[PDB]
Amino acid sequence: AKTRSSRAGLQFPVGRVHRLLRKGNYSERVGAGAPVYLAAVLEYLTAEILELAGNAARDNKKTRIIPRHLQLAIRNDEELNKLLGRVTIAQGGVLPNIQAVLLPK
Amino acid sequence: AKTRSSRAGLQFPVGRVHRLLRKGNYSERVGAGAPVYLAAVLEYLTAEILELAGNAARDNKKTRIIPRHLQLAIRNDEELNKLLGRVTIAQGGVLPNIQAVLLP
Amino acid sequence: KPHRYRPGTVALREIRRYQKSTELLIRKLPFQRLVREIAQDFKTDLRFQSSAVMALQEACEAYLVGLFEDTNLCAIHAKRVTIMPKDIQLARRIRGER
Amino acid sequence: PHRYRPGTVALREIRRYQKSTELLIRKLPFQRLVREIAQDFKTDLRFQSSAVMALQEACEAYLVGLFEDTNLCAIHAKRVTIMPKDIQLARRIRGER
Amino acid sequence: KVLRDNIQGITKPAIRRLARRGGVKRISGLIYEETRGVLKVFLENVIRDAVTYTEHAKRKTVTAMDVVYALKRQGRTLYGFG
Amino acid sequence: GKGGAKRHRKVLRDNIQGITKPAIRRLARRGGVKRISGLIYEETRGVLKVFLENVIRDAVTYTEHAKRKTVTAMDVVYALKRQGRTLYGFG
Amino acid sequence: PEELRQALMPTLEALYRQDPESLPFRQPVDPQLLGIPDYFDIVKSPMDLSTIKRKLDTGQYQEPWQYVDDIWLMFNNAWLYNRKTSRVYKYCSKLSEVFEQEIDPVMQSLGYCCGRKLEFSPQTLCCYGKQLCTIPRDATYYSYQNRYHFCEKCSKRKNDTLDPELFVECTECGRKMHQICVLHHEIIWPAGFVCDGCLKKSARTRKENKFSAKRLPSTRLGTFLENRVNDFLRRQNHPESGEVTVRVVHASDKTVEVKPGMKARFVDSGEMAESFPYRTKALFAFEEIDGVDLCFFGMHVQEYGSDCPPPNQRRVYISYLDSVHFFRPKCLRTAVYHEILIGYLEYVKKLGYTTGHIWACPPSEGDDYIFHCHPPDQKIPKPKRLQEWYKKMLDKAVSERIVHDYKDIFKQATEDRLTSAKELPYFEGDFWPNVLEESIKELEQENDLSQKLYATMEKHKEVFFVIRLIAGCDLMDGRDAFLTLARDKHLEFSSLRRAQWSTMCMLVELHTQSQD
Amino acid sequence: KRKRSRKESYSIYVYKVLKQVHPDTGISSKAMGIMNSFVNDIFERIAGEASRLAHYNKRSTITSREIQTAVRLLLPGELAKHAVSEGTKAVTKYTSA
Amino acid sequence: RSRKESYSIYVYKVLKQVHPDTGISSKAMGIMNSFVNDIFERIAGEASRLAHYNKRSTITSREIQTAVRLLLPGELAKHAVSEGTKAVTKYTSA
DNA sequence: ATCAATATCCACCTGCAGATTCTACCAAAAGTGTATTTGGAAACTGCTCCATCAAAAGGCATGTTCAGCTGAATTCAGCTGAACATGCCTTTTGATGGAGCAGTTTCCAAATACACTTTTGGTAGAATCTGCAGGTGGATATTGATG
DNA sequence: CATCAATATCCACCTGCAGATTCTACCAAAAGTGTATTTGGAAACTGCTCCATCAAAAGGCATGTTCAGCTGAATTCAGCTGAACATGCCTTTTGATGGAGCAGTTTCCAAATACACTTTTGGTAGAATCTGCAGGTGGATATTGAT
């Protein structure tokens, strides 16, 4: 009748997450609400990262999200930067920063 | 009436590491030679670290191995230190190492 | 008297240009030859995918940019603006790979 | 009055504390600090003695590594005295900050 | 008892001795405070995970098992406690 | 064969020097470096080689397990992930 | 010999001024200098453009076709000795293109048709031991006395050859002229061949060609189709449109036999007839382009009369159909096809036929239904666009109140309360009898027949079209003979001139077969 | 032939998420791949942490509590709190659904 | 009382094989047990991951040999691979 | 160059918490013989894509010169190093009510395991749409240089 | 310190292009529900180990003070080696093109479970003996600062 994601008000597929947990050999048993909770967490993370990327894109006068916009979104937020401190974004570049000593006069 | 541990001739228990592999649910199937290989590798590493610790104690005129000897053995071996680069040895301390600039 | 900018103005200009841009800086063929010879140093007659070479290039430039940032901070710490071998040696030693 | 040169005692202490392995920070203040931090996080907690010992040893190890990095940075800057700037430099390069 | 303000319990000669283990000869005045602050930051990093492990396990006491697991998950693996 | 056009290109052996001066300069500039010493270039080349020895060794070791001798981008993604340098966009 | 030189310096100097493309051909090929000692092993004629200049200056060419053959031989040698990825190959291709562009006006200035080297497509041979199989192209094949051919499973060489075009020598001026370009047939003009220039010099005209489609025997269906097409063209009033003649050149009575499986299952029970008689008709559409008759459309149909046993009564089926995109204008070719098929549907419905069947099966790649050697630029329609075209055909037909309605075969079977395979029409060469035999065999290994038939009909419901019309010459006996004749005589339709030559060849063959 | 290659991705789901957040914003192929890799990496990390926690506590079943604990452990403070709140609301309303 | 497994006797036997006349402190044995446990955990986890990427649901000698090659560097890796190969060929030869 | 005050390494003796050597258990392991299942050994193959060659140009290697980058030499305010008086904050021993940790029983909501009808997503081909990279014509500080 | 002026660069903009977007239809792969089975952790009770608290004699660094020698910081000046530029040149990228490998397909035999018996044995309760460095004592020996 209704999908688990639609029943739980989520966009990510709950049953797919359940299957991935099943075949990933994490544990012998997996609960019904665990995929729902995980899908909700992933949905929140995705929504936040995409809204930050959209803000970066509209700041850069661009209407399409590019990996540069993703780098601007991820790195400008120190919380996400702590989350992804050991991950490099392809075609993301680095933030424009100049050392005080290197600055003229 | 021959146990698999005696058949392999290795000190480490093959059945015990097989049971540990089963309990961790690493995979839904575990091969027959997998516990043997794990036991062999763990025993080899243990033998190397123990002989290094015994040698370090011998240079220290000590017949009892202490965690300080463990630190001396691990940190004096380049590849062993690389393997345990992010691992702290309890009651081990640090190696005596001071720069030549600091010396007068 | 031909026009000549002093070192420091155009230098920061190109620094900003390369920091606001994301295109690859290492040429494809020399890096590909280097990675292929290093691969055959371990196993002869290996084959490479284009996406694999792209991933190697991205990882190498990201790591090199991080290392250069660390060296820049080390040099600024030592009342200097030029990175020198002692700076990079210290950065690599305290990072943990050495 | 016999007086040693400034530095000889420092070398003596460095050798003594690099030869030994016994824990240097006092047990009771560290345990009290751990209790205060736990209370600040969540009230009505208890700590095993082994947990306190593990926390103490890990803290000494981390601080010793930080001291190695700070000393190496200070020597890099043609200096023998360590200053906080070395500490934040080492922490920033380590990626903790 | 909600005891407070024992950060001075991190003894200044104790910091000097710990730096002596680190091969340092000379220590400035602010080094003691900086080491106290970084130690506090490390304590915040570790005790948070330890208390979370304690809470998930339906326990009201902190054991060395959770402490060593938190340290090892933090990239600071510790031995001597299993 | 014919053709009437060829070049020795004796750079195959020393491909470590194949990383051009402007390339290394651009990589340094992207890191915020204002001035570059003359000895930085060969040391950075050696560091790049060492990083290659770290990553491609794991990639090749992954490759032979799958009964294959062609390296896949997924394999190097895993090799970078296991070293704490996970790369995105090649999944 | 100064006139030929004065004609031939322009093209060769145009070739020379293409640098650095012409640079490698300025000097003789030296194996030791270029490091190619195998050049003489493969190339049997070592000579170059400098040799061509020397021969031209000394008057070694009696007539320009020798120079054309020499330059094309050099192009072929350069193409064969070097792979197409090489620089020399693309330079030779550029020189060949420049020569093709330049020689045509110069070659025509002397009175010749053109200066192109034209070779036919490779001729696929046929097997002899099996008498049913053929010799595959671009594969190893066996030959004996150049008359017997054998395949792999039935001299060891590979079939990769090109057949050059024939030449006809002028009776008056003696020039060697192509057969195809001016469309000259010995049968039509036994007196001899006279070039256009000689005819215009003496104010003469070519003898009237009575081997034409317009002079073919007239048929009521062909006359109806031709006058309907002419009326439609007049209504459109296209300046580029011409006159279209449609003639029915084949009409014979044949009988189709029930396949052994169906014969055993139903015929032996006294429920179905042993055979269904029918009349097959083949018609072609011819148009006058530049005063030349050209075939551009053709049809093969089977007509079952009232004397045929049911359920084939009053049914017509289109076995095959083909078309060539050389009709003028291009835009009205599709409309002319609409008019031809609507005219046929009106004729069959006036005769008394009530049901029409169309099989929308596009030709496979490399396969030709009627016209052999389809042009390379003619795109083969996909099944979806072919079905859309057939739907447009049906919509245009119903728009004229000629066809009452149209339905798919599944819908027609559902409306016809079909309960068994006996009620379906039985056509010669149709896919339905073959798939029914396959289903019978599958049941042999394993209402079941009806269920399989329903499943197959639903699977391929969009392929077969059923039309409800009423509601309330051994050379053309099949498409195999015409294709075989075209392959043997190199009657290709890949170009306008080749298509016109094939049209005259088939018209002459039909005229000669008419008289016995 | 049945030679149709198949590969799993969250492309349509993240696309619908974007239209839920930014209807007038698109995603490039490189950005789509980066987002898919990020989702896969975070999923693997959080699921492995949950499995590790369950194994440590002798738990053979994965429920929402250990996933919430893992989120608190590894996800950053504000992010972890918001994700925990949204997941709790989602599971609570799914229970009554 | 819940059973608490430890590798004490096996480490002692290895010592007697290597250093018959050397003692062991209680703290050192715990360090040995922790080292064995975490090394085994790392090898098993990375081997399971490797089987996961290649869509393999069985842990065989190849995956764990690859895991040893990846974690242990150089001479220890080669020696462990050699001893594992001889152990497995002896196991399959019996 | 020699010399007196200190810390270092070391030989040697002794009480003791801890490392090592006996005796018996038993249940959690550890080992072994069928029935079963199945990831995988193995061969032929359609389909990707990986190695290789030619031209355009977007760049890369070289010589010149110089005021700033770096490096060497000198001096100083101070502060942290060394020494010492006073002592007090932590150690260890020993004991204790009890909050809290963990051993054992039961079983009911939750998860497992198919069967099945329901729906659902990744791909192949169609054709319209669109965000974005260059470049030509302004044009905007800006910094080196002139004054 | 105010401005003649060449130039990298941002926006005002635009027109062309590969890619992101929109649509219809196909079909194999998930997926929710139903039915039957299994189970494991929450409640319920309870034995017990070690967490927290108390108390006192005692000491060795904790705390504070005092004297001063080096030491980073500041300053100045000099050798110089990278930065910016102009020049000659040259290596690269993409397009196109042969076959080398990568999975899809089909057979099926060696190999890993489930579980029923059958058997070795690792902490560990319990107690008596060997063992090696913690701690203290004493005098040989480098160390060092300035006599």
Author numbering:
A (entry chain G): 14 to 118
B (entry chain C): 14 to 117
C (entry chain A): 37 to 134
D (entry chain E): 38 to 134
E (entry chain F): 20 to 101
F (entry chain B): 11 to 101
G (entry chain K): 1051 to 1204, 1232 to 1523, 1578 to 1603, 1621 to 1664
H (entry chain H): 28 to 124
From the study:
Here, we report cryogenic electron microscopy structures in which a p300/CREB-binding protein (CBP) multidomain monomer recognizes histone H4 N-terminal tail (NT) acetylation (ac) in a nucleosome and acetylates non-H4 histone NTs within the same nucleosome. p300/CBP not only recognized H4NTac via the bromodomain pocket responsible for reading, but also interacted with the DNA minor grooves via the outside of that pocket. This directed the catalytic center of p300/CBP to one of the non-H4 histone NTs. Representative writers of lysine acetylation (Kac) are E1A-binding protein p300 (EP300; KAT3B)8 and its homolog, CBP (KAT3A), which can transfer an acetyl group onto the NT lysine residue(s) for all four histones. That is, p300/CBP reads H4NTac at the bromodomain pocket, rotates in multiple directions, and rapidly writes NTac to non-H4 histones within the nucleosome independently of the DNA sequence.
When the 180-bp nucleosome containing H4K12ac/K16ac (i.e., H4acNuc) was used, we obtained a group of structures in which p300BRPHZT binds to H4acNuc in several different modes by three-dimensional (3D) classification. We obtained the 3D reconstruction density maps of p300H2B·H4acNuc at 3.2–4.7 Å. In p300BRPHZT, cryo-EM maps of BRPH were detected, but not of AIL, ZZ, or TAZ2. The structure-determined p300 multidomain (p300BRPH) bound to H4acNuc in a Slinky-like bent conformation via bromodomain and HAT. Around HAT of p300BRPH, the density of H2BNT toward HAT could be modeled for the C-terminal residues after D22. In p300H2B·H4acNuc and p300H2A·H4acNuc, bromodomain binding to H4NTac interacted with the minor groove at the superhelical location (SHL) + 2.
